[PDB]
């Protein structure tokens, strides 16, 4: 069968060549037979509409920023967590080790099937002006992702956040409905955010995972061989996603820059203030053992 997956980004960006090299995978392992058709540009709604979809089975798969299921599934709140993660090398370490599991593994509760992490770089503010200090953030009106975490966030951080979905932020930004919001760089590039806010502060207040999810419904019909076919295809598909998105991070940079951009670089941002005011938000949700179990072996990984 052809499984459908949704995506936010267009069809060259690096999680939907990823889902797609995937499909290709999957359709040898089963000669033939078996594919996914990525249905890229939000076409099947918002990411909180498409894992809903997934949940009941209405579609197959999603490939889906972490944050998307902070009001489902509790453990999905830890890798968002501000200034979780040191570093790159640490960010995979983590989870792509027994912790990173422990996360996939809350998502069957909750009717999917978590099949792999992306990586997805480090989300950083963009605006209209730089900002080095939680100063510089008061007044403005920053777009974030539907979460209550990334809600406080942005407002530990001294903005006014609005919940928006990733498709509308374009416009609301040309519309000065908000007129800031935080991404990583490629996101930033391929969305044109940077043509209406040109000041690219590197913040780097979360490294938030994108996350593969398969319908656990449509999952439970499926034969072990064919859901092990499902989960081969899906972890060979995360060196291809790393090569391109290692790739991406660095020609993102370039892009913006020669389109107007002004990037403040990570050490002329004062990172202790926005560390100092955001780190209470690590005990306000932490809603269980299991999930301050699970942060702790995070941070004990060096
Ligand atoms: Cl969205
Ligand atoms: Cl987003």
Do not use: C
Request: aromatic share 8%; glycine share 6%.
């Amino acid at each position: 069968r052809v499984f459908r997956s949704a995506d936010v980004h267009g069809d060259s960006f690096p999680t939907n060549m990823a889902v797609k090299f995937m499909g290709d995978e999957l359709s040898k392992l089963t000669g033939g037979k078996d594919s996914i058709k990525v249905f890229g540009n939000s076409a099947l709604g918002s990411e909180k509409d498409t894992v809903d979809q997934v949940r009941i089975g209405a579609i197959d798969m999603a490939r889906v920023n972490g944050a998307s299921f902070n009001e489902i599934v509790p453990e999905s709140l830890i890798p968002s967590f501000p200034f979780l993660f040191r570093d790159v090398d640490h960010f995979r370490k983590a989870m792509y080790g027994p912790a990173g599991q422990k996360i996939l593994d809350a998502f069957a509760a909750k009717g999917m099937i978590a099949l792999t992490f992306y990586e997805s770089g480090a989300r950083s503010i963009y605006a209209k002006r730089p900002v080095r200090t939680p100063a510089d953030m008061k007044g403005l009106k920053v777009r974030v992702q539907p979460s209550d975490l990334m809600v406080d966030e942005i407002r530990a951080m001294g903005g006014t956040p609005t919940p928006m979905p990733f498709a509308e932020v374009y416009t609301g930004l040309k519309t000065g409905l908000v007129d800031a919001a935080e991404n990583n760089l490629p996101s930033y590039e391929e969305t044109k955010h940077f043509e209406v806010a040109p000041d690219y502060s590197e913040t780097q207040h979360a490294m938030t995972p994108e996350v593969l999810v398969f319908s656990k419904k449509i999952w439970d019909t499926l034969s072990p061989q064919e859901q092990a076919a499902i989960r081969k295809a899906a972890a060979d598909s995360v060196p291809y996603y790393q090569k391109l998105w290692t790739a991406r991070e660095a020609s993102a940079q370039q892009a913006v820059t020669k389109g107007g951009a002004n990037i403040l670089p990570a050490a002329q941002v004062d990172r202790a203030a926005f560390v100092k005011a955001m780190q209470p938000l690590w005990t306000k949700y932490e809603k269980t053992p299991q999930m301050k179990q699970i942060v702790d072996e995070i941070e004990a990984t060096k």
